[model samples]
Target: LATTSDHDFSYLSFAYDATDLELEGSYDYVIVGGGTSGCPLAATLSEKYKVLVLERGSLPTAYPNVLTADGFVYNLQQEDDGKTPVERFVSEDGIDNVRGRVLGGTSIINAGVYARANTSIYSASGVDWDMDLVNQTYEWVEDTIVYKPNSQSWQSVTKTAFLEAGVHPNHGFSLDHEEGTRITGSTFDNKGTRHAADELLNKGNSNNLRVGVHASVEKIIFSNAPGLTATGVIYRDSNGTPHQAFVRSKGEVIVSAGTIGTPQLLLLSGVGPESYLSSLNIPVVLSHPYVGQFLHDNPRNFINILPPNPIEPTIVTVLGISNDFYQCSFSSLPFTTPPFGFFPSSSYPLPNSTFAHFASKVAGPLSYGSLTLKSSSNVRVSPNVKFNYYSNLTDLSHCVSGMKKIGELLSTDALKPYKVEDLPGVEGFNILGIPLPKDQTDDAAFETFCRESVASYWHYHGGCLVGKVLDGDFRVTGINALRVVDGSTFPYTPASHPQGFYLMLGRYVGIKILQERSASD
Candidate 1:
């Protein structure tokens, strides 16, 4: 195994703790929230211009839980102390959701599944993408951190179970989004170390890129010199000492503050609906109607199985994909403390021993919701978000179908060995918390289960949507020198996980901006 520590990253040379920054400064580009897309966006933009990334959390080196695969559950166990890496927020829908507060952003806190956007998503996304450049951008991200997972016994059986359940033809391994069971790329190496988007920042010209951790951007600074334009931002370091970072007139302020953060910041900056902003006594800058609209979180309905024998705990490696649903597996081996909060369920009893998790998320949720501010002054406070999980009949319908497929897989002959032997106490696989409905034909029962047991896949998207809040070029509409580049701009969830595409969007926009500037010169 190649020995590399988080503290050893060369990118740290240009990275700093924001508490040590100046009260005032100017740069060519000011990016708010150094996250999944922000790191790549800064890296590409720094090639020829000065770019500053302001992140709200510490570097990946500061958090050991974020550095390895084994620490996934441990990281989830901890809560954000206004300094911790994983920021937790429970939705009004009663689902516990989280976003990464670390330099790597959500990429550091996720399963690290890497997959590209499907063709339908590309067309649905309002941005005008250069297809050729899209391919190249994906490769750029993969080269830095992506790797094929070393399939183990659990993953192999999962693949077999999917086929046996009639999910699809076996398409071995691929990065492309296909309609079948396949092994996708991951950001974790064979050594069990996680490589996050924070590594992408290492690729930029260090002299041109500067990253400041613990730099929480509170609001976008605006000026109406001639027209509405974002000048810079006012942020608070860990100590609550506010500092200002400005962009040149020709430069721009880009917000990659995640799906939730983007819209929340917009409203905080008075760029959202006038009525909403005015109600809070915040002066309105622009009356953008759809700032926190169309929020969608993939609803995950899953079951836990207690293996007869010890099984290795592993992250998601194999997923069964169909036009209607998406299924994946996550193995939870013996945990230090009965891994209670790893996957948020509706308060279910846990198996004392280790268990395997099998889930099917509603694909392309047709139902959507909105997000609003809970506190006007602090960006750290979790916003009042209502994802309205399974709010639409169509999404609930898909959940019913997906769960039925899961039941089919559990009964597959391939999984027989993993199942418990014949006994009054043991039947099929010893399932924890609410066994799958024995009557597969009962659509009504399945619907109730899907709704009651629904959980967040943490794959939420859309708040600052393209064509609504931003233009075709990603620049915020009705405002100048401001843009948003993150999953917040997605019309729908682009892939199994949007982190890969999020990284690409950063590079994509950076490349386009540089080309545009060069043309003008």
Candidate 2:
């Protein structure tokens, strides 16, 4: 934590409110959930209005797990003891994954790979988004956290496989999602440290911005007299003491709490489907039939193969296939030595035996789910989320096609040298491995495997969809002085990674808020 005497320190508060230390303030803008979008949004808003950011986790600097490339996997796998930066939850389909609880949100714990959204996503968003402004915002965000990575050994090998698979002319290193194989940017810089969105707070006006970590917002307090006007928010400090922070407008309260958090907070505040909120004995402030509806995530599945030699660690060098209907990424994990056997000698693992993992993401899923309150209490509440993966027949068909594409890539000359030794019945490759069922052949077996092994890419989106729960500019329907800006606002999942898109959306919304404020004045 920065000292109170420092300029940056004036904007940060790390501890919980104590006996005489109550955290109380009234700002022009009170932002919630300081993650990929919240930090950047707060910085932009602080330029014109006093902003208070309430984050539910610890500061990114205090948590070293979010600063290193090697710690990426470790942080996400952290247990939910209410002390870690990662929070784990199970979907209705019974698959469990983690979401960021820290200042930078999921960006600090993700693979750090970056890619822009397909143009179709914006056109479908129902917003009159200026392309010029969108491009400018991307530049601002990319200049802060994005970096070009030096190709590792296995990364180079994957490039060859992509081109050899007829994925079109390699575009080399670039940030745009063109029609071909290209090396995408990452938040991890050349020094092997992650550059997350939380760094944007450095650019905020220290006198006008205040950030409180370990602060959990319980609900948005609305006016009792008339319309659904959100006057302030009631949040609990780290020690479980509740306090209220009001907002001064033309500036309003922005809910950037992300997919799960946004809907969960809204439902708690009595702004969901009427029947559902009534069942919990909570008075409904407003009935929005679409608050928790239409939730979905990018479904992903992995295929493992054994290479003849040890492979180096590479996070993700993408293969955009079938006009972006599906995308595949390649990486290798090494085995342990001695009792585990000596494998490859990379920074990831020094073992001699290596296994390649292919991750395929279903770009646009037709299946959807919902998010509801497990309990009314925000602090102890775990959202009941359901992501019905492969529930759509077409989505299942795409998974099968993606698996076949992986098979094709493995047969290519660039990857043919690697043996299929990861399987149990495959001979010679079982030097230090576990065997698999030998009867796993034919398309039927592949389809069945995809059904059973399909998992989430962790890119949870929708719920507060633009046209449904929110207007084009991200304002919640029928609610005043309230807005939502995050992945939850996306009408559907784009065909690529969403972190880069989320950052750009943050900047775009901030500018919109500023413009709206000026016009009203």
Candidate 3:
């Protein structure tokens, strides 16, 4: 009955708010958020135990937009009302972005570029991850969603220019991280089908797993029987009817609600800093001061250019890595075509001009921010998130360096054939009245431009850090039978596109849960 056929997935999906549904059954594992982390974890854990996955969004298979690589920007450009699969939000800095509300989470809406971080990302972090197991887990994840870049026209030229600029000696094509220009692995396969983390669930014993979409988890239900322990979760179906699912295993409740949702859920369930919870009249079960602090994201900027002729529309393919400082990827916008409002231009195509945007990010930023709850209800509230992009002076300097590096990459002799011209007026010259010309080498002007226009890579992480909020095993400090497995648990954002790491984190946590269960049994 658990067939891989897309249409037959109804066997795995729950009859939400069923008239005769019993809400009292005990599940061995209750996973909140059927996302990149939650779905994979459910797949792994269900191999040996009954699992319940509560997702706040729809199934990706039901939404064709979720799987179309060509519609990446179209998805994010949707309105923020509860109707769409992409939730749009503006940061405290006034830059806007979107987060995925589908079963696959952000992986469904993101530019499908993929890359595995160096193993050192996990080893150095406080998480006591089994590297051998982690490496094997990558294969499990990579086998499902990873694919090599299939860039055809302009992307081919951008790759060549990065090498001519001497970003590093060409590393050639592979998933391993090295200092050089290389094509990225993408979630979209050769057929242009976008595979996401939710697909992994089909590989597992699906009968043991029950997935409920449109199920929004309100909070974790804790027990006061002996010590502080999570017993289950309370969630509401799409109808807004409340239901409770309990966990029978010492394996516990896992929260994979992502960076914003995870911390918001924890704070609502009285598991955050006591000072904050008391102010909102929520009883404190645990006081973890780092629950929503230490939030970090890769602050990125775009170096846009207007090419003379129409270019084949494409997403990221090639990447340039600096010496642990920053990374840059290439993308384009066909302004003359439909879906016109994606870019900030008063004019449509500037006379047959296609916009090429060089997106760059500071690999590791010193600046960190916080997320605090405005209301207890996840449905009725938005967490006050402040990325505080350039709060650290060093972060500002690194971003400026990234912007400067983009200029070098585009100016390379290899890019001469494209005849791409700088789009200064479109992107704003600078707040200091310094126009960013093709060869402008003013470091001060670049820094000013960076401060004025830097936006996030949408790779927000570290709100619930491994060393501070959770222990080496990803278990929340001062709480039992509860663990968080998502980007929020990452101690630091890896110096690359984070989907690869997020998928691996899912496999790592899933295996960790099984190992712990085996040992305890």
Flag regions of model 3 displaced more than 4 Å: 1-21, 333-353, 378-380, 420-440
Global CA lDDT computed for model 1: 0.85
- Name the top lDDT candidate: 1
lDDT of 3 by residue, 1-521 (tens): 01112322433454243222355657988888888887788889989998888888877765677777777766755555775778766667666656778787888888877888865666678866677887888888877668776656667777777887778877777676667788767787776667778777875676788877787889899988457889998887666678888988575899999998999999999888888889888888888899999888777776656555556667676778775455554455543342322322223233244556677778776788888887765644668788888888887788777777776665676555445344332232211122244445677888777776676788888888888889988888877889999989865666478888888888788888888788988
Candidate 2 steric clashes: 10
Span of ten consecutive residues with least summed lDDT in model 2: 338-347
Query: How much lDDT does each candidate structure score?
Result: 0.85, 0.73, 0.73
lDDT of 3 at 482: 92
- How well is each residue in 151-256 modelled by candidate 1, as lDDT tens digits? 7788888999999889787778888777899998888888778988888898899899999998989999999745888999999987779999999858999999
Best by TM-score: 1
Better of 2 and 3 by TM-score: 3
Please state the error at residue 107 of candidate 2 in Å: 0.6
Provide TM-scores for the models: 0.96, 0.89, 0.91
With a 3 Å backbone cut-off (N, CA, C), the pairs that clash in candidate 3 are none
Which lDDT value does model 1 have at 262?
92
Model 2 deviation from native, Cα RMSD in Å: 5.5
